[PDB]
Amino acid sequence: MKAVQYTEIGSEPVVVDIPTPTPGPGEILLKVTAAGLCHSDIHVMDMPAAQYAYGLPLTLGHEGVGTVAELGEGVTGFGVGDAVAVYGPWGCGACHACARGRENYCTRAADLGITPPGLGSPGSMAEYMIVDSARHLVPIGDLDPVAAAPLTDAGLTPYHAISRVLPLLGPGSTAVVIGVGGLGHVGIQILRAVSAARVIAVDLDDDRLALAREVGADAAVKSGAGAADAIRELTGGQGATAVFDFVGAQSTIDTAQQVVAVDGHISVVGIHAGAHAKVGFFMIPFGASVVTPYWGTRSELMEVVALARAGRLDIHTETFTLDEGPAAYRRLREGSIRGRGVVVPT
Amino acid sequence: MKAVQYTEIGSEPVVVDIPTPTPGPGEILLKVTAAGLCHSDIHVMDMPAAQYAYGLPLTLGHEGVGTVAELGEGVTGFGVGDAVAVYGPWGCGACHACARGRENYCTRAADLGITPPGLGSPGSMAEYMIVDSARHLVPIGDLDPVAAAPLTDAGLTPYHAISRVLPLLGPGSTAVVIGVGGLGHVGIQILRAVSAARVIAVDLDDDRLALAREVGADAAVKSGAGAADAIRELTGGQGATAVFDFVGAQSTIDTAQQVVAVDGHISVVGIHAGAHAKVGFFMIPFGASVVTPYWGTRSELMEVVALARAGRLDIHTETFTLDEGPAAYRRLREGSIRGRGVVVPT
Amino acid sequence: MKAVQYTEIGSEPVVVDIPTPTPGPGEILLKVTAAGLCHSDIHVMDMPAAQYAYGLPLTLGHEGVGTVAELGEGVTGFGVGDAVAVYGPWGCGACHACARGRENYCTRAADLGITPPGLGSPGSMAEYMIVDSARHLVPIGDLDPVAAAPLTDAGLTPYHAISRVLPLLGPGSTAVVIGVGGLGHVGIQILRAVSAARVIAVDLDDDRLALAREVGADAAVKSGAGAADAIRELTGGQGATAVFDFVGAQSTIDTAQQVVAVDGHISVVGIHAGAHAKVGFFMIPFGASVVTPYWGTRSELMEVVALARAGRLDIHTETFTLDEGPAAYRRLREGSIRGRGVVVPT
Amino acid sequence: MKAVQYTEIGSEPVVVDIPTPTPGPGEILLKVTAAGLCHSDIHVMDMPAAQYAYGLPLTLGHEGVGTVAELGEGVTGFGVGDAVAVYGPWGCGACHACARGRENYCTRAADLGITPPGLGSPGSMAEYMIVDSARHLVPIGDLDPVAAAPLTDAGLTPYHAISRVLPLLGPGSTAVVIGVGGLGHVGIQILRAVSAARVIAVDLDDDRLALAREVGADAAVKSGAGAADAIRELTGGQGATAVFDFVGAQSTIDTAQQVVAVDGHISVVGIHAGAHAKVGFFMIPFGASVVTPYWGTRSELMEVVALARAGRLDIHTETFTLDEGPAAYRRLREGSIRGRGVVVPT
Numbered sequence A, B, C, D: 001m002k003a004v005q006y007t008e009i010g011s012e013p014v015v016v017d018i019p020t021p022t023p024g025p026g027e028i029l030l031k032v033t034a035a036g037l038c039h040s041d042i043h044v045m046d047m048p049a050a051q052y053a054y055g056l057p058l059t060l061g062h063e064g065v066g067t068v069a070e071l072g073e074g075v076t077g078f079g080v081g082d083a084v085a086v087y088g089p090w091g092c093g094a095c096h097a098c099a100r101g102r103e104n105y106c107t108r109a110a111d112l113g114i115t116p117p118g119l120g121s122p123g124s125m126a127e128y129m130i131v132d133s134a135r136h137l138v139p140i141g142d143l144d145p146v147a148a149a150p151l152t153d154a155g156l157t158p159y160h161a162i163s164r165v166l167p168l169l170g171p172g173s174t175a176v177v178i179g180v181g182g183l184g185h186v187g188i189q190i191l192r193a194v195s196a197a198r199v200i201a202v203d204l205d206d207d208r209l210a211l212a213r214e215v216g217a218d219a220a221v222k223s224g225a226g227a228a229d230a231i232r233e234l235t236g237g238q239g240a241t242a243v244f245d246f247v248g249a250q251s252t253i254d255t256a257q258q259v260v261a262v263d264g265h266i267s268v269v270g271i272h273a274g275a276h277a278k279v280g281f282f283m284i285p286f287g288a289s290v291v292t293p294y295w296g297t298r299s300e301l302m303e304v305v306a307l308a309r310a311g312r313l314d315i316h317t318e319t320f321t322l323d324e325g326p327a328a329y330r331r332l333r334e335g336s337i338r339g340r341g342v343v344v345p346t
C-alpha cells in the first residue's frame, strides 16, 4: 500500500510502498477515507535525534477516518463498511481515568508502550491503518470523511479544553479564543453551540479575524501589544471568564493573564517550548485557574461528531492526495492552509 | 466443574456438574475465589414462567471475584494469577454512556442481548467463570476475596446511588438510610467515608439498628408510621438532605417523601414491584429530586475497591461452600444473614 | 395610586385606588414600568376560602420591572432612575440555600412570614411597588420593560429547570418541551442558547407548535396519546435526555415517562393538583431523575437577563393597561394570549 | 472601648482607647467574644508606606466572632445575644459572584471601596465591632468562641481551596498538604471529614509532622529536596491527585509541580511575593490545573461551622487578652504558636 512515512531524522516525509497490514485478535483494519494534518506532526519531525522516541519508520497521521475493511478475530460492534473516526489518544483501557473514557489522561500507557497512531504506532496517512481495539472507533455514519477527519483532534482538543470549564461559560460570560487556525476556528464554533458565552477572537492575521467572524465570533481583535486593553474595552473592565489560547506562545499567555477574570480560567492549548503561565499571587487574578489540557476523551469525541452531524461545525478544509502529502506538510509550515489540511487516499 | 444453577421455574437452585468453559478471543477465564448472594437473585427465581427471560439453565451469582486462570487470545493487561473483581452490569462498551464507564446505563445492551453474569450469562457461583472482556475486570490485589465479592454490588450499588447526589451531602447535610441489610450497612459506611453527612439509619429490626450503629450511623430509628416524625425530631424540622431507601416498599418511599428536604433527594434503590415515589406539586418538597438508580459504573467499582483496600468498608459476611449454596438462599429468604452471604468454591 | 387587587374570594380582580407606599429602612420604592401576568395568578384566585392564606386585599403581579423612585434609609447599590427587574421568590437571605442565592429553596421563609410580591406581599400590578431589599433587584439597563417583565418568572422558571440538568444536555442530547405557552416558548429559546440539545416541542394547539418553530424548536408534535411514539420516532428509539413539562397534567407526565431516556430527567414544572410522576422500578427508566422545581435563583435571574440583553430571548408579549388588567386575566383563562400578557401603568 | 490598632507604618500595633461605635441602618454591632490572629495581618504591617492602602488608624483582626449587642434600624434575622461568626471577605452583594455567596470573588468590591474588617474597615481585635450587613453574620449557636474564630479564615480558606476540586478527591485519590500550620492543620482535618483522599502532610518541623498525624494525616514527610521523591514513593509513582500548598514559597510550589498527577490540581494558598507555579507544556503534567484561591464563600463558612459543631474540626488554639495582643503578634512572627492565636476581650 501507499503511505507517507517519516524515515530519517530532520528529513522531510516521503511517499512509500509498504505491506497492507492484517488485523490480529481484537484489532480492526480500516481503509482510510481521510487523514488530517496537524501542527503537532511538525513538532514531531522537528525533534532532534536524542528526543525522538517514536521509532523509524513511522506512518504519519493521528487524525484518522475510514471504513472497516477487515475484523480481527473476536471483534464485534462493527460490520465491514461502517464509516468510523479513530480516537487518537490511546490508553490502557483499565485504569480509573480510562474507565471513564479519559484515555487522554491514562497514567499507565507510557509504561505499557501504548502510543497513538501517527505518534508511535502506524498512522492514518496511508491507504489502510490498524486500530488496536473497537473502543477506539467512533461511528460517523454519512458524515463527509474530509470534514470528519479534523474532528478527531482539531475538534476534539478544543472541545475538551472548553468542556473542562463549561460550567463557567453561562449567559453573561466572555470566552476569548487566541489563534484562529485549525483548532481555534473550531473552538469558536464549539463555544457557540454549547454555551451562551460572548466569543472574542484574537489573531495576528486580519484574514483569520475574518474567518473568526465567518464562524460566529462576536468580535475580533488584532493580537500584540494592544490586545489585552481592547479585550478589556469589550468586557467593560470585568475581564474574560475564559481564555482558550491555541497559540500558547509567551506573548499570548501574557495576554491571557492580563485579561482573565477573577474566578475565571486560562487553557493553554497551543504548544511553545518554554512558554508558561505564571500562576501566583499578584501575577494572576484570584481564583483564575490555569491548565494545559491534552487531546480529549472518548465521550467528548462522540459529542464532537454529534455536533458535526447536527450541522453545528463548519470545518474549513483543503484536500490533498497521498502524493501531495509531503507538499501539504510544507504548506502547513508556512501557515498557508486556511483551516485544516486533509489527505484522501485514491 | 461444580456450580449452583436455577434449572426449573419456581423450584430452588441445585448443585450441578457442568463443563469447565474455555475463553475465546477477548475473554478471560477466572477461577472463582468468592461469589456473593444478593436479594435480587431471589426476585429472579420468584419470577413466573412468562416473565423469566434469562434462559435455563442459569449459573447464579452476579457478585464475583476470582483469579485469572486463562487468557483468551489477544487479551492483555492481566497475567495469570491476578486477583480481580467482576464488573457486573455489562454494556456494549461503545455508546456514549459506556465510553464514560457508565455501562449500567447502556442504551443498546438490551437490543444486543448483553446480559450480566448471573442474570443471563453464566455467573460466579461455580469453580470457574467466563468474563467477556478485560474492561469488566477490576484488580483487587491482596484484598480478602470474601470481603471483596459484596463490593461488586452490595458496595457498588449504594456507592452509585450516593455518588449521584454527593454534591448535596456537605457538612450540615443529613442522609437517611432506610434498610440496614446487605446494601444499607455498606451505604452507611460509604456516606461516612466520602461525606460529612449526619447519617440516620432506619430499620424494622432492632438488631439491624445495632448493626447501623456498629458501622457508623449517628442515629437509628425504628421504621413504620412513627419514623418520619422521629427523623424530623433529629433534623430540627429541616428534613433530610438525602434519603437512600434500600427497601423500596411503598411505606418506606412514603416515609422518604415525608422527611426529604426542600432541594434534597430520594434514591429509591430497593425493589418492590408497584411501589413508587409520587413526584408532583404538594406531594413532595420543591426541588426534591427522585430517581431509581441501577447498579453502578466502572470507575465507581474501582472507587469502592479503593475504599475497601483503605480499610473504610467493614463488610459483614458469612461464608458458605458451593454445596451449602441452596441452603444459603433459603437463609437469605428468611432474613437470617447479618450482612451478605458469600460462597467460596473449595 | 392605581392597582389591580384580589379583594374577595372567588370574585375577579378589580381596579382600585390605594396609598402610594413609602419605603422604610432597607426597602426600595419602584415606579412600575411592566407587570407580567402568570398562569400561577389564576391558581391563586381559584383557591377556596380555607386554602387561601395570602391575605386580603392583595395587589397582584409577581413578575415585576420598574425604575427606582425612592431609596429607603441605608440603601446603596441603586440610584434613582435605575431600571430593575424584581427577583420574586424572596427568602430569608441568611440560610445555607439563601447564601448561595437559592432563595427559591429557602427553608425558613415560611416560618418567618416572608412571601413573594403578588403572592402575599403587594405586587407589581400597580403604578408603584415596594421591594424589601436591594438584593431582590436585578439591573436590566436599556432592556425594554415589556420584554423584561416575563424574564422574572416565565424566563427564570424554565431557566432554573433546565439549569438543574444542564450537564446532561450535551451534543447528541434531546430535550422535549411540553407546553409552548408563556414559559415553554422561552424554555425552547433557553435550550438553544445554553445547550446543543435537539429541541422537540409538544402542544395541543397547532398555532403553539408554529410558535415553537418560530422560536427555534427542531421539531413539533401534537400532544395526546400519539405524542410519545412520535417523540420516539424523532429520537431513533433512544428516548429524550430531558423532558421539561410546563403543563404538568397527568397525561403530559405520562408522556414524559414514556419518552425519557435511561439516565435522563423529567422536570415537572407545570402545576396540576393531583398530578404526579410515578417514580419506581419498571415505571420509569433506570437513572431517570424526576423533580418539581420552583421558580429560580438570584444568579439565574441575572443569567436570564444577560440572555435577553444578548438578543437570545424573543419574548412574545401583548401589552395591557391597568384598566385592562381584569380583562387580561379573563383572556389568560381562555388561553388566547400568544405568549405572555404584560401590564404597563400609564 | 479597648482595641489593638496599627497606628504608624513599620511600628508594632498598640493597645488603644477609642469610641464604642453605633450601628446605622442595615448594620449590626457585636460584642466581640473572640478575635483570631492570622499570618496575613503580618504581611499587612510589613507593607511599605507606598504599598499600604488600608488607612490609619486600623483596628486589626479579620477573624471575628461575637454576640449581637445592637441592631441598626431595619435589620431582621438576628436577636440581641445571638452568637455569630463574621464572614470576612465582604463584597458588593449584588454581582453574579456575590449573589451565589461568592463574595470572595466579587468583581466590584475594589472599585466601590468595600474592604474586609481588619483589612480596611474596623476589625475584631476590640471589645465591639461593626458589621455592615446581616448577610455577613453566620450563627454559631453554643460553639466555643475561641475555637470558632479561626473557622472564619484558618478553616474557611483551606475549606474553599479543597472545595474547588472536591470532585477529584474520591476514594483512590491522594491529597498532599504542604505546611501544617494554622491553615494546614485544619486542611488535613477537612480532607478527612469531606473526602476519602489519602492525606500526605509535608512540613520542615518534625513537631508539625507530629501535629499532622495527631489530626489525621496518613503520612508525613520532611520538606525540602527529598520531599517530591518521598511523595512519589508513597503514591506508587502515580503522583498526588491534589496538592494544597499552604506555604506557597517557590520551593514548595516546585515540589507541588514535581508530584501532582496527570489531571490533578495544585492550589497555591500560601503567599510569598514573586512565587508562582509555571504552568506550560513539559513543566507540569497534562490536565493538572493550578489556582491561587482567595478566602472562601458564605455557604462554605456555614459548612465549616457545621463541621466544627459536629466535632470534626479540632482547632489547636492559644488564648490571649487584648493587652497581650501586641506580644501575640511578635509570637506569631517567630512561629511559636502551635496552631492559631486568638484574642478574647475581658
Ligand SMILES: NC(=O)c1ccc[n+]([C@@H]2O[C@H](COP(=O)([O-])OP(=O)(O)OC[C@H]3O[C@@H](n4cnc5c(N)ncnc54)[C@H](O)[C@@H]3O)[C@@H](O)[C@H]2O)c1
Pocket (backbone or CB within 6 Å): A038, A039, A040, A043, A153, A154, A157, A178, A179, A180, A181, A182, A183, A184, A202, A203, A204, A205, A208, A223, A224, A246, A247, A248, A249, A251, A252, A269, A270, A271, A272, A293, A294, A295, A332, A335, A339
Ligand atoms: N493540547 C493538545 O493536546 C493539542 C492537540 C492538537 C494541537 N495542539 C497544538 O495547538 C497549536 C495550534 O494548532 P493548529 O493546527 O490549530 O494551528 P495552525 O497552524 O492551524 O494556526 C494557528 C493560528 O494561530 C495564529 N497565531 C500565530 N501566532 C500568533 C500570536 N502571537 N497571536 C495570535 N495568533 C497567532 C495564526 O495566524 C493561525 O491562525 C499547535 O501548537 C499544536 O501543536 C495541541
Ligand SMILES: NC(=O)c1ccc[n+]([C@@H]2O[C@H](COP(=O)([O-])OP(=O)(O)OC[C@H]3O[C@@H](n4cnc5c(N)ncnc54)[C@H](O)[C@@H]3O)[C@@H](O)[C@H]2O)c1
Pocket (backbone or CB within 6 Å): B038, B039, B040, B043, B153, B157, B178, B179, B180, B181, B182, B183, B184, B202, B203, B204, B205, B208, B223, B224, B246, B247, B249, B251, B252, B268, B269, B270, B271, B272, B293, B294, B295, B335, B339
Ligand atoms: N438498584 C439496584 O440496582 C439494586 C441492586 C441490588 C439490590 N437491590 C435491591 O435492594 C434491596 C435491598 O437489598 P439487600 O441485599 O440489602 O436486602 P437484604 O434482604 O439483605 O436486607 C434487607 C433489609 O431491609 C430491612 N427492611 C425490610 N422491610 C423494611 C421496612 N418496612 N422498613 C425498614 N427496613 C426494612 C430488613 O430488615 C433488612 O435489614 C432488595 O430488595 C434488592 O432487590 C437493588
Ligand SMILES: NC(=O)c1ccc[n+]([C@@H]2O[C@H](COP(=O)([O-])OP(=O)(O)OC[C@H]3O[C@@H](n4cnc5c(N)ncnc54)[C@H](O)[C@@H]3O)[C@@H](O)[C@H]2O)c1
Pocket (backbone or CB within 6 Å): C038, C039, C040, C043, C153, C154, C157, C178, C179, C180, C181, C182, C183, C184, C202, C203, C204, C205, C208, C223, C224, C246, C247, C248, C249, C251, C252, C269, C270, C271, C272, C293, C294, C295, C332, C335, C339
Ligand atoms: N414551578 C414554578 O414555580 C412555576 C412558575 C411559573 C409558572 N408555573 C406553572 O407553569 C404552567 C404554565 O405556565 P404558563 O403561564 O407558561 O402557561 P400558559 O397559559 O401561558 O400556556 C399554556 C400552554 O400549555 C399548553 N397546553 C395545555 N394543555 C396541554 C396538553 N395537554 N399538552 C400540551 N400542551 C398543553 C397550551 O396550549 C399553551 O400553549 C402553569 O401551570 C403555571 O402555574 C410554575
Ligand SMILES: NC(=O)c1ccc[n+]([C@@H]2O[C@H](COP(=O)([O-])OP(=O)(O)OC[C@H]3O[C@@H](n4cnc5c(N)ncnc54)[C@H](O)[C@@H]3O)[C@@H](O)[C@H]2O)c1
Pocket (backbone or CB within 6 Å): D038, D039, D040, D043, D153, D154, D157, D178, D179, D180, D181, D182, D183, D184, D202, D203, D204, D205, D208, D223, D224, D246, D247, D248, D249, D251, D252, D269, D270, D271, D272, D293, D294, D295, D335, D339
Ligand atoms: N488565601 C487567603 O486569602 C489566605 C488567608 C489566610 C492566610 N493565607 C496565607 O496562608 C499562609 C499560611 O498561613 P498559616 O497562618 O497557616 O501560617 P503559619 O505560620 O501558622 O504556619 C506555617 C507552617 O508552614 C510550615 N513551613 C514553612 N516553610 C516550609 C517549607 N519550605 N516546607 C514545608 N513547610 C513549611 C511551617 O513549619 C509551619 O508549619 C500564609 O502565608 C498566609 O498569608 C492566605
Ligand SMILES: [Zn+2]
Pocket (backbone or CB within 6 Å): A038, A039, A040, A041, A062, A153
Ligand atoms: Zn494533533
Ligand SMILES: [Zn+2]
Pocket (backbone or CB within 6 Å): A091, A092, A093, A094, A095, A096, A097, A098, A099, A103, A105, A106, A107, A108, A109
Ligand atoms: Zn489507562
Ligand SMILES: [Zn+2]
Pocket (backbone or CB within 6 Å): B038, B039, B040, B041, B062, B153
Ligand atoms: Zn444484586
Ligand SMILES: [Zn+2]
Pocket (backbone or CB within 6 Å): B091, B092, B093, B094, B095, B096, B097, B098, B099, B103, B105, B106, B107, B108, B109
Ligand atoms: Zn453501551
Ligand SMILES: [Zn+2]
Pocket (backbone or CB within 6 Å): C038, C039, C040, C041, C062, C153
Ligand atoms: Zn408565576
Ligand SMILES: [Zn+2]
Pocket (backbone or CB within 6 Å): C091, C092, C093, C094, C095, C096, C097, C098, C103, C105, C106, C107, C108, C109
Ligand atoms: Zn433562607
Ligand SMILES: [Zn+2]
Pocket (backbone or CB within 6 Å): D038, D039, D040, D041, D062, D153
Ligand atoms: Zn487571614
Ligand SMILES: [Zn+2]
Pocket (backbone or CB within 6 Å): D091, D092, D093, D094, D095, D096, D097, D098, D103, D105, D106, D107, D108, D109
Ligand atoms: Zn459583588
